[PDB]
Design an enzyme around this catalytic site. Sequence first.
Site, PDB file in Angstrom:
ATOM      1  CE1 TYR A 250      31.253  95.217  49.711  1.00 28.33           C
ATOM      2  CE2 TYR A 250      33.010  96.601  50.510  1.00 28.33           C
ATOM      3  CZ  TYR A 250      31.806  95.948  50.749  1.00 28.33           C
ATOM      4  OH  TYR A 250      31.161  95.999  51.976  1.00 28.33           O
ATOM      5  CE1 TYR A 467      30.774 101.183  51.934  1.00 24.01           C
ATOM      6  CE2 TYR A 467      29.658 100.449  53.911  1.00 24.01           C
ATOM      7  CZ  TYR A 467      30.507 100.172  52.847  1.00 24.01           C
ATOM      8  OH  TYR A 467      31.072  98.925  52.688  1.00 24.01           O
ATOM      9  CG  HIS A 468      26.085 100.209  52.052  1.00 22.39           C
ATOM     10  ND1 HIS A 468      26.127  99.439  53.169  1.00 22.39           N
ATOM     11  CD2 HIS A 468      27.108  99.787  51.277  1.00 22.39           C
ATOM     12  CE1 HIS A 468      27.133  98.574  53.089  1.00 22.39           C
ATOM     13  NE2 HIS A 468      27.734  98.751  51.932  1.00 22.39           N
ATOM     14  CG  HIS A 566      29.226  99.336  47.124  1.00 26.99           C
ATOM     15  ND1 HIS A 566      27.974  98.770  47.012  1.00 26.99           N
ATOM     16  CD2 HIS A 566      29.752  98.866  48.277  1.00 26.99           C
ATOM     17  CE1 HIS A 566      27.767  97.976  48.048  1.00 26.99           C
ATOM     18  NE2 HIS A 566      28.862  98.001  48.832  1.00 26.99           N
TER      19      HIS A 566
END
Length: 623
Positions: A250, A467-468, A566
């Site tokens: 990340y 998210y994603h 992300h």
Amino acid sequence: TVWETPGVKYTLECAKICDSDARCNRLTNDLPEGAFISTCSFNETSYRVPETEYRICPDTDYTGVNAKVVEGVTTIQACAELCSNTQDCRKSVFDHINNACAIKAAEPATSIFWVQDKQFSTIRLPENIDPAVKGKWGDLIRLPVIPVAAYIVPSYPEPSRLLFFSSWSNDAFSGASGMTQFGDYDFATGAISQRTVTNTHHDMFCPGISQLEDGRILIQGGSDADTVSIYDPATNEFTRGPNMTLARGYQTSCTLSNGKVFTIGGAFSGERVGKNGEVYDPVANAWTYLPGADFRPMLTNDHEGIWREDNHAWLFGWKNGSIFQAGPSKDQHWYGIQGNGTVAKAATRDDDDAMCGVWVMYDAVAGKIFSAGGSPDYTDSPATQRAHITTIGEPNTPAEVERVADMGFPRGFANAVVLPDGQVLVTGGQRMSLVFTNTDGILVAELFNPETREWKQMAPMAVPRNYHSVSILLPDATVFSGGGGMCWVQNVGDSTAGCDKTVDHSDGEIFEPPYLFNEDGSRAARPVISAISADPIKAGATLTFTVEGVEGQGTAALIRLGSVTHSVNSDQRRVPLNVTVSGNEYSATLPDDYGILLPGYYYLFVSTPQGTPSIAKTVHVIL
Ligand SMILES: [Cu+2]
């Protein structure tokens, strides 16, 4: 054999009986029960109520907050009537097994999803969307792999392919695996394949991505936290890069003026500790740790602690090898690779962190950066409407931050692209950041215009992109919005049966902006770049190409190709050009500075003075 309905499909006397009972699965339609939709998979009916007109779609539900649920209604017709008799009813649902009529609540305050379910039927008063004002979305493109990370493949005369990847599985992730599921999508043809990439011993889930000078993609860390793969568009193969000096996940990487790649943070994978900077030299093919590139200043404050706090830095390669870090930490900073790395405060963007807010350099020439959305914590955190223009002059000298109009919606895990006119399109995100949820997904895209400093609500997409999820510019000047979901599972090759599959969106949808339409909603006439040299050009040099099919003088802009995951796109960038035309022949003097014209593969867009862009021609800037 498969007995199609008068468009359903079973796999022939019990079949007609089964297709009577709304509770009967054991059914084999294209998309399965649960699948989100942009359009009635089946044959729509119309239906009027002694007034002024509803389109019905069988075997489909509208999920979300209802204004009303009424239990005494036995016909789609009676359900049409409660909707007709209920103020501000655009959308109702007839429940076949229970004889109930749900009226959906007002959009876009509420998020309403179209799912496939034989227990229900959807009813709606048809929307009139003017694509001249709100753009237009296409239908869900299904994909073998959730597009959790994506990048355009550099190619001549323009790119045709979007690589994307997830993890060891197409819909799930664990830890170190050494394999990654990849999807290949030719959007010139609609062709689609998947491959499994094991040859580099790299699960590329949760990585840094940066496009090199030669248009190779550098895929860094993630589930295998110390591992680097390099994608050659030339070979369509992956190569093992040298391990990073410090294992990270990340994190963000950014390509610098000199074509080295800087990265900092990435506490998700490897040691759960903050991560100081390092830099990749592709010539020497070597990473160098940068202890003085200190993580502590760029730290967010997160309820989950340091694990989260150095994730997804808003990094930009700038003049003379500098790095600008716009966030998401409340304070901005300048990072360098000189000596053993450097760091200094540049400005304060806001009074709170904006983890996974959107950010794009929409005008490199004017040192201009647009940022919106984010939440003060990674997850379990309400998102902000706040948005800023950040202006950067010289490196390691204060930067200027102007707060601008609030977005129309708070957005956590949204994505952003700059378009040829330098407007920024924000897509997806949710009201409160909650990893692995469709909850309060904003379907309405928003266009922000830096010249107006004003927002404008676009047409709604079909599927929640939280998210994603990902967003990226296509060569034709449209935007692909896609993915969302994925499931943590203890070990590699564990079963995904216990996973909430409703959050998975192994698919994407493409938005045509307003600029592709005339006032009557017909497609506007795109200028054509008739001829361009496939030769690489260097900064300060002069680009010459031949434009046909424009009334008046075209403007032009270069948009560096995009990599994305992300809410992080550290490769995209808009470089607006000054053109001088003699007849059909257009000529542009590229900027002197590689801090503005980062090396790599760009889109050249010539666009009409009304703002309608060409299909792009691939342009390669070299050092
Ligand atoms: Cu993740």
